[PDB]
Amino acid sequence: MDVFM
Amino acid sequence: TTLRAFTCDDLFRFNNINLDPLTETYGIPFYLQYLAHWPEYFIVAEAPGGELMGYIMGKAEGSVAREEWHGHVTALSVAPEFRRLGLAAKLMELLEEISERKGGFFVDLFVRVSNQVAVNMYKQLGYSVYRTVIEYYSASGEPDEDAYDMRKALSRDT
Amino acid sequence: XXXXXXXXXXXXXXXXXXXXXXXXXXXXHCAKVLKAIGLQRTGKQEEAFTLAQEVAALEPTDDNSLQALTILYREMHRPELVTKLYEAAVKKVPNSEEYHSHLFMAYARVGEYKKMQQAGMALYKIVPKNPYYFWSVMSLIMQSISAQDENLSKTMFLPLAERMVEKMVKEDKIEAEAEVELYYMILERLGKYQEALDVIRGKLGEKLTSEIQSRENKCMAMYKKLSRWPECNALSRRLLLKNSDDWQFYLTYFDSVFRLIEEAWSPPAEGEHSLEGEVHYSAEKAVKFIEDRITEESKSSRHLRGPHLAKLELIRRLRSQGCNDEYKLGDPEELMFQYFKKFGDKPCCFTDLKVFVDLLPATQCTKFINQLLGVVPLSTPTEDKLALPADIRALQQHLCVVQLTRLLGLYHTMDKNQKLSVVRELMLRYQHGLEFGKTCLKTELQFSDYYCLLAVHALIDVWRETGDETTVWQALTLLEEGLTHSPSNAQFKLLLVRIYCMLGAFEPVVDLYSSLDAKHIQHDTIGYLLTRYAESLGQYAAASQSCNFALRFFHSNQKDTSEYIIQAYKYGAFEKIPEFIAFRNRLNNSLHFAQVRTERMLLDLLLEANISTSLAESIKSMNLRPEEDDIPWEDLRDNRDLNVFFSWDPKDRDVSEEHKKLSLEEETLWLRIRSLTLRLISGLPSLNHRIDILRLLLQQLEATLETGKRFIEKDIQYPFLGPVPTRMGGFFNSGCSQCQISSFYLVNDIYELDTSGLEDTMEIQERIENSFKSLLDQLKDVFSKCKGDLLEVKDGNLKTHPTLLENLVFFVETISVILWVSSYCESVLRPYKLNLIIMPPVFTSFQDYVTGLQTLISNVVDHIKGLETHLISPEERKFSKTVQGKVQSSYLHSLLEMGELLKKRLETTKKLKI
Ligand SMILES: CC(C)(COP(=O)(O)OP(=O)(O)OC[C@H]1O[C@@H](n2cnc3c(N)ncnc32)[C@H](O)[C@@H]1OP(=O)(O)O)[C@@H](O)C(=O)NCCC(=O)NCCS
């Protein structure tokens, strides 16, 4: 999972 | 069961998957960027009667002839009524096969250091640990959580 | 260095980007005004546009000015002014690649598909490396998906594109990957499937090895659309010999094996068996393959659930043709019992046995459950207690037995004493299931949370079939206990949202929808649970925030998906561009967008309208023209989820397609009641300075208020986890439909008096006199139906009344309309009274009596004095005092906002006394 922005 | 590609109009059915505390929803420019640029690394899995079992996003963005052409994993989730089936290992195996086909040079990953489930799964698949990014996962008042950059070297090729 | 220093300081955050750019005007060329203006488009549009349109007409031909103006025009939802930039940079200079490519991207932004083709072909004529030739061919299908169902869609646009591609297939300028996808898309769209299959199976398909199975999934679609079954069966069989788990190929294998014994297929004497080889026929050739897949799966360390479900699918499809001839597949009860014996401890045993549960003989559903209970390792029953599991492996095998007892229709036969003993048993098992999973990491479901949900779906099943009201509080304490133990289960939060809304509370609903983190594109599929109940229960601040969040998502959808249709030419998608077009149409034609948009305009009206905004200056800031609706009405999507709730219900009482269809019909009827009310309200400024348009919206509104009233009489019973019946049935019981219609008739009579005059109109003035006196007597009758008590204490229970709160929001939303229309008639009679005799003395009495009614309703919303005086396992006896303390303190917060709005609405009647 990566960060949203 | 039914390892197909994540069409748009599956952004409206993936709600047993994204109502987890560890799974994000990323907005629509993110999903459509990863559908336009890299639609190979965007497998979804579907049960007999719909019920999306769980998707996997991903990209391959680096630079060859610096030994950095790597294949990322930028989401992975399995719906909580379909876990412990071997589905997540199947989706990581398919992403390693795809990112081995187009050259290769490791597979990366970003996992927060809170869940020993995901980290102790990636230790068992074969992923070693690289640097620990400090204060990576930002929010959404909640504290920022560090991230284990994980790298699995596979089948070295330009 | 005047261009690098002055610009990098002009992009700092907001105001250092703005002040250093505003100081860069008297300091020094073609774009200094644009860099000074682009950071003050926060709230003021005209102060930005007075230099935006000034700098968009000076022939800019610079990358900074054009790159900033293509952001400034795109952010204001006006892309039509982007295309007029780069052609202004083309007609001055015929640039090689940059301005022509940006002009093509601006055309694809604005949507001009018939004008993008000429720009793409011109850019191919200038610099022909070879993606610019296929951008014009993609636009030649962009102008064929828009204008569909025509001879001029497959005789003028698609064969031209096929000839445009086939001019390059004769040559060798096809050496890429997206062009084979584009040529297959064109050859598929035209209807030449036989010619489309051979471009994959031939030489151009070998360049198609980019995805996993993008060759054998594009041959299967053609093998189906050509009705070529034996080359479909062999491909599905050869893809099942690789995974033996794909359910998408067991289905095509069975579909194209039983059609091969329907067609009476016989193999050729030469060849292998077909173009893919080793084609099976029916039964024997299809039973031995499945009974081989089971055996080959049995010798692995993975335990696939593929072939065990394939056996049951084969035994349903052999039964669907001829049931008397059975070979060796066995009874489906023994197969489902052995599938439970293997895959019992997994959470997916129900959701695979759900689809094959029709195979049971419909009478042995109480013998199959007693057979399944014999294999779970449970303890000894009669130690003055219940029979309990001992592992986690033997708790999931019992949770699946309780779920299958629910699905087979055995918790719907009992009669509310056994159906409370079941809840007692499933709460003892939930309280025991917390000994395991004590060390869970707080982001997992405790291991037996679905013992709580099966003891809540059996309490709401008693409440909806007896009207008990002593079980809703029990279900709420069960969900609150289950949510304080595993505070990341989302089914508990969704059911708590639903039960707290169906009781009348909404403060815990906004605090529980903020908890499950619903981010972008959940606002279309879970946000209906807030939008439907937000303004309905009198919570206006939470309704304003919910409408603002959903509107922010849908407007960002419009802009951002236009940008990412542009950015799928550059990466050579050409197969997702119809998918991205269908995604934009699904999210702009969506039902929840129309509901959030019209409820946002109606909230802006009845909060900032005739209080502190002039209904005329309040309409101009929303562009509500009462001759145009931006609602599609014909491609209304309704992409709400409706299956986000786990329901173990017996598959003949949950969410059929009939309930989804009737729910869409009811939301469209109430949206046509809401949008017509909004458009009829917005004609009242713009009525004093045509009535020919506001007399037709009344004929539409009294038609849809009769269609709704005939819909409510069609007494439909939605299930509890179903689609949430609308306020329309509560709009007619509390008589407020006729109470607004009898006012939109009054504005019609006042306009006819205005265009006629008070000279010889003694027939209109008596009708206005009898309309005031009958408009107030309906407002005194909404009050008699909304007069009651919101919380009781009757025989030790609570007995919440939410109907007396919904009829009290339908009164504020009605007297807001009455005080808008009555503020119009004050704008008509006051110049007549100043020009100087029987009818204004009945307007003065109507005005002196509607204040005397608003004081009475602002004193019955002193239920705050009547609600604050309620004094109202032992841990279950603690959570009752939090559940009831949440329902009471949400009724109090609803009445606070409604009383605070009426105490501002009563002050507007001091500007109407004339
Ligand atoms: C839930 C999740 C475990 C997926 O399950 P999965 O893909 O079916 O896992 P698998 O069945 O394929 O097996 C992988 C290994 O993970 C381990 N594992 C999975 N769940 C575990 C648990 N609760 N406890 C201990 N180990 C666990 C197991 O050791 C398993 O090995 P096994 O095959 O011998 O059982 C996890 O991957 C997930 O998707 N979480 C939601 C998103 C997330 O948390 N992280 C995304 C990564 S950034």
**Domain endpoint, select from C713, C748, C765:** C713
Enter the tokens of residue C376: 């779970």
- How far apart CA C86 and CA C73 sit, in angstroms, is 13
Output the CA–CA distances (angstroms, integers) from residue C832 to C2, C88, C561, C690, C914, in the order listed: 67, 57, 55, 20, 10
Nearest Cα neighbor of C357 from C323, C407, C398, C305 is: C407
HSE-CB at B150 with a 13 A cutoff on CA atoms is: 23
Same domain, C766 and C799: yes
Chain C positions touching B120 (Cβ under 8 A) are none
Interface test with A, best of B17, B18, B22, B24 (most A CBs within 10 A): B24
Enter the tokens of residue C791: 């919380």
Q: Across the B/C interface, how many CB contacts are shorter than 8 Å?
A: 144
- How far apart CA C562 and CA C74 sit, in angstroms, is 10
Q: Could you tell me if residue B67 is left (phi over 0), alpha (psi between -120 and 50 degrees) or otherwise beta? A: left
- How far apart CA C54 and CA C834 sit, in angstroms, is 48
Order of all β-strands in the sheet with B128-137: B110-112, B145-151, B128-137
- How far apart CA C160 and CA B118 sit, in angstroms, is 53
A4 annotated ligand binder: no
**Domain endpoint, select from C681, C713, C745:** C713
Number of CB atoms found within 10 A of residue C152's CB? 9
Q: Is B150 helix (H, G, I), strand (E, B) or coil?
A: strand
Nearest Cα neighbor of C819 from C764, C779, C787 is: C779
Kindly report the nearest CA distance between residue C352 and chain B, in angstroms.
7
Same domain, C685 and C811: no
The experimental method is cryo-EM
Q: Which residues of C423-445 are buried (b: 16+ CB within 10 A; e: fewer)?
A: beebbebbbbbbebbeeeeeebb
Close Cβ partners of C726 (under 8 Å, ≥ 6 residues apart):
C532, C666, C667, C670
Chain B positions touching C576 (Cβ under 8 A) are 8, 35-36, 39
Same domain, C599 and C738: no
Position C247 in a domain: no
Q: Is B52 helix (H, G, I), strand (E, B) or coil?
A: strand
Close Cβ partners of B38 (under 8 Å, ≥ 6 residues apart):
B58, B59, B60
Instruction: Determine the residue of chain C that is closest to B48 in CA distance.
Output: C247
DSSP B56: B
Q: Is C54 helix (H, G, I), strand (E, B) or coil?
A: helix
Q: How many Å from the N-terminal Cα to the C-terminal Cα in chain B? A: 33
- Does B33 reach chain C within 8 Å, measured CB to CB? yes
CA-nearest residue, atom 28 of ligand 1: B121
Q: Tell me which residue has tokens 């893919």.
A: C276
Number of CB atoms found within 10 A of residue C612's CB? 10
Instruction: Indicate the length of chain B as a whole number.
Output: 158
Enter the tokens of residue C530: 């807030």
Are the beta carbons of B29 and C564 separated by less than 8 Å? Answer: yes
Which residue type occupies B133?
V
Backbone angles phi, psi at C745, to 5 degrees: -75, -35
Enter the tokens of residue C820: 């808008």
Same domain, C746 and C709: no
- How far apart CA C616 and CA C686 sit, in angstroms, is 8
Question: Does residue B19's CB lie within 6 angstroms of at least one atom of ligand 1?
Answer: no
C373 close to C365: Cβ distance less than 8 angstroms: no
- Farthest CA pair distance, chain B: 46
Same domain, C668 and C595: yes
- How far apart CA C43 and CA C36 sit, in angstroms, is 16
- Does B89 reach chain C within 8 Å, measured CB to CB? no
Interface test with B, best of C215, C313, C348 (most B CBs within 10 A): C348
Q: Which among B43, B52, B121, B146 is the best mutation to test ligand 1's pocket, defined by most ligand atoms within 8 Å of the CB?
A: B121
Q: Is C422 helix (H, G, I), strand (E, B) or coil?
A: helix
Chain B positions touching C519 (Cβ under 8 A) are 24-27, 140
C104 close to C120: Cβ distance less than 8 angstroms: yes
Close Cβ partners of B71 (under 8 Å, ≥ 6 residues apart):
B41, B58, B59, B60, B95, B96, B98, B99, B102, B104, B106, B107, B108
Taking only Cα atoms into account, the Rg of chain A, rounded to an integer number of angstroms, comes to: 4
CA-nearest residue, atom 46 of ligand 1: B76
Dump the DSSP string for B81-120: TS-SSSHHHHHHHHHHHHHHHS--S-B--EEETT-HHHHH
- How far apart CA B106 and CA B157 sit, in angstroms, is 10
CA-nearest residue, atom 13 of ligand 1: B86
- How far apart CA C285 and CA C289 sit, in angstroms, is 7
Using the mean position of ligand 1's atoms as its centre, give its distance from the Cα of residue C402 in Å. Answer: 26
CA B83 to ligand 1: nearest atom: 8
Enter the tokens of residue C767: 């009708």
Instruction: Determine the residue of chain B that is closest to A5 in CA distance.
Output: B26
Chain C positions touching B55 (Cβ under 8 A) are none
Q: How many domains does chain B have?
A: 1
Q: Is C101 helix (H, G, I), strand (E, B) or coil?
A: helix
- How far apart CA C293 and CA C250 sit, in angstroms, is 11
DSSP B138: -
Position C240 in a domain: no
Kindly report the nearest CA distance between residue B57 and chain A, in angstroms.
9
- How far apart CA C405 and CA C11 sit, in angstroms, is 64
Backbone angles phi, psi at C380, to 5 degrees: -80, 135
Chain C positions touching B86 (Cβ under 8 A) are 302-303
Close Cβ partners of C352 (under 8 Å, ≥ 6 residues apart):
B47, B48, C305, C309, C339, C343
Q: Which among B26, B52, B83, B137 is the best mutation to test ligand 1's pocket, defined by most ligand atoms within 8 Å of the CB?
A: B83
Kindly report the nearest CA distance between residue A3 and chain B, in angstroms.
6
**Domain endpoint, select from C679, C713, C747:** C713
Position C482 in a domain: no
- How far apart CA C423 and CA C601 sit, in angstroms, is 45
Enter the tokens of residue C673: 């009641």
- How far apart CA C740 and CA C526 sit, in angstroms, is 32
- How far apart CA C540 and CA C213 sit, in angstroms, is 52
Number of CB atoms found within 10 A of residue C550's CB? 23
In this structure, the strands spanning B110-112 and B145-151 are antiparallel
C244 close to C304: Cβ distance less than 8 angstroms: yes
Kindly report the nearest CA distance between residue B131 and chain C, in angstroms.
24
Q: Which residues pair with B32 in a beta bridge?
A: none
Number of CB atoms found within 10 A of residue C190's CB? 16
CA B90 to ligand 1: nearest atom: 12
Q: How many Å from the N-terminal Cα to the C-terminal Cα in chain C? A: 70
Burial tier of C163 (Cβ tally within 10 Å: 0-12, 13-18, 19+): exposed
Same domain, C663 and C744: no
CA-nearest residue, atom 15 of ligand 1: B121
CA A1 to ligand 1: nearest atom: 48
Dump the DSSP string for C513-526: HTTTT--TTTTTTT
- How far apart CA B31 and CA C856 sit, in angstroms, is 54
Are the beta carbons of C246 and B2 separated by less than 8 Å? Answer: yes
Output the CA–CA distances (angstroms, integers) from residue C317 to B49, C135, C259, C287, C376, in the order listed: 16, 47, 11, 12, 31
C603-610, long-range: CB < 8 A, 24+ apart: C603/C535, C603/C540, C603/C543, C603/C544, C603/C547, C605/C678, C605/C681, C605/C816, C606/C812, C606/C813, C606/C816, C606/C901, C607/C540, C607/C544, C607/C901, C609/C816, C609/C820, C610/C816, C610/C819, C610/C820, C610/C823, C610/C905, C610/C908
Backbone angles phi, psi at C238, to 5 degrees: -75, -25
- Farthest CA pair distance, chain A: 12
Question: Does residue B32's CB lie within 6 angstroms of at least one atom of ligand 1?
Answer: no
Position C498 in a domain: no
Q: Could you tell me if residue B58 is left (phi over 0), alpha (psi between -120 and 50 degrees) or otherwise beta? A: left
CA-nearest residue, atom 12 of ligand 1: B86
B95-101, long-range: CB < 8 A, 24+ apart: B95/B41, B95/B43, B95/B56, B95/B58, B95/B71, B96/B71, B96/B152, B96/B154, B98/B40, B98/B41, B98/B71, B98/C212, B99/B41, B99/B58, B99/B60, B99/B70, B99/B71, B99/B154, B100/B154, B100/B155, B100/B157
C725 close to C717: Cβ distance less than 8 angstroms: no
C185 close to C574: Cβ distance less than 8 angstroms: yes
Q: How many Å from the N-terminal Cα to the C-terminal Cα in chain A? A: 12
Three-class SS of C614-650: CHHHHHCCCCCCCCCCCCCCCCCCCCCCCCCCCCCCC
Please list the alpha-helical segments (H only) found in C146-206: 158-170, 178-189, 193-201
- How far apart CA C279 and CA C266 sit, in angstroms, is 10
Same domain, C816 and C898: yes
Please list the alpha-helical segments (H only) found in C734-761: 737-756
Same domain, C829 and C800: yes
Q: Is C431 helix (H, G, I), strand (E, B) or coil?
A: helix
- Does B48 reach chain A within 8 Å, measured CB to CB? no
* Cross-chain CB nearest to C517 (options B4, B94, B140): B140
Are the beta carbons of A1 and B112 separated by less than 8 Å? Answer: yes
C587 close to C561: Cβ distance less than 8 angstroms: yes
Same domain, C645 and C752: no
Same domain, C756 and C880: yes
Domain holding B60, by residue range, is 1-158
Chain C positions touching B87 (Cβ under 8 A) are none
CA-nearest residue, atom 39 of ligand 1: B77
B117 close to B84: Cβ distance less than 8 angstroms: no
Enter the tokens of residue C280: 């099976």
Dump the DSSP string for C263-293: TT----SSSSSSSSS----STHHHHHHHHHH
Q: Identify the chains in contact with A, defined as 3+ C-beta pairs within 8 A.
A: B
Backbone angles phi, psi at B44, to 5 degrees: -125, 160
C621-630, long-range: CB < 8 A, 24+ apart: C622/C682, C624/C678, C624/C679, C624/C682, C625/C682, C626/C679, C626/C680, C626/C682, C626/C683, C626/C686, C626/C693, C626/C694, C626/C697, C627/C693, C629/C675, C629/C679, C630/C597
- How far apart CA C646 and CA C358 sit, in angstroms, is 20
Nearest Cα neighbor of C511 from C546, C547, C554, C474 is: C546
C158 close to C141: Cβ distance less than 8 angstroms: yes
Same domain, C689 and C836: no
DSSP C725: -
Using the mean position of ligand 1's atoms as its centre, give its distance from the Cα of residue C790 in Å. Answer: 49
DSSP C359: G
Same domain, C690 and C781: no
Using the mean position of ligand 1's atoms as its centre, give its distance from the Cα of residue B85 in Å. Answer: 9
Backbone angles phi, psi at C272, to 5 degrees: -80, -70
What is the H or E stretch that residue B149 is in?
strand B145-151
Kindly report the nearest CA distance between residue A5 and chain B, in angstroms.
8
Q: Tell me which residue has tokens 């549960």.
A: C357
Close Cβ partners of C277 (under 8 Å, ≥ 6 residues apart):
C234, C238
Taking only Cα atoms into account, the Rg of chain B, rounded to an integer number of angstroms, comes to: 15
Q: Which residues pair with B71 in a beta bridge?
A: B107
Chain B positions touching A5 (Cβ under 8 A) are 27
Domain holding C839, by residue range, is 734-914
Enter the tokens of residue C72: 């400034």
CA B76 to ligand 1: nearest atom: 46
Enter the tokens of residue C38: 């682009």
- How far apart CA C247 and CA B104 sit, in angstroms, is 30
- Does B116 reach chain A within 8 Å, measured CB to CB? no
Question: Does residue B118's CB lie within 6 angstroms of at least one atom of ligand 1?
Answer: yes
- How far apart CA B72 and CA C331 sit, in angstroms, is 48
Question: Does residue B87's CB lie within 6 angstroms of at least one atom of ligand 1?
Answer: yes
* Cross-chain CB nearest to C246 (options B3, B11, B12): B3
Enter the tokens of residue C22: 């505003």
Nearest Cα neighbor of C708 from C672, C680, C677 is: C672
Enter the tokens of residue C172: 């060798």
Q: Which residues pair with B45 in a beta bridge?
A: B3
Question: Does residue B78's CB lie within 6 angstroms of at least one atom of ligand 1?
Answer: yes
Q: How many domains does chain C have?
A: 2
Number of CB atoms found within 10 A of residue C696's CB? 11
DSSP B132: E
C134 close to C178: Cβ distance less than 8 angstroms: yes
- How far apart CA C881 and CA C716 sit, in angstroms, is 35
Using the mean position of ligand 1's atoms as its centre, give its distance from the Cα of residue C648 in Å. Answer: 26
Dump the DSSP string for B23-46: -----HHHHHHHHHS--TT-EEEB
Q: Identify the chains in contact with B, defined as 3+ C-beta pairs within 8 A.
A: A, C
Please list the alpha-helical segments (H only) found in C650-736: 657-681, 691-694, 696-713, 728-733
- How far apart CA C714 and CA C718 sit, in angstroms, is 12
- How far apart CA C218 and CA C201 sit, in angstroms, is 10
Are the beta carbons of A1 and B140 separated by less than 8 Å? Answer: no
Q: Tell me which residue has tokens 């930005």.
A: C48
Dump the DSSP string for A1-5: -----
Enter the tokens of residue C826: 């004050």
Which residue type occupies C113?
Y
Q: Is C389 helix (H, G, I), strand (E, B) or coil?
A: strand
Using the mean position of ligand 1's atoms as its centre, give its distance from the Cα of residue C357 in Å. Answer: 29
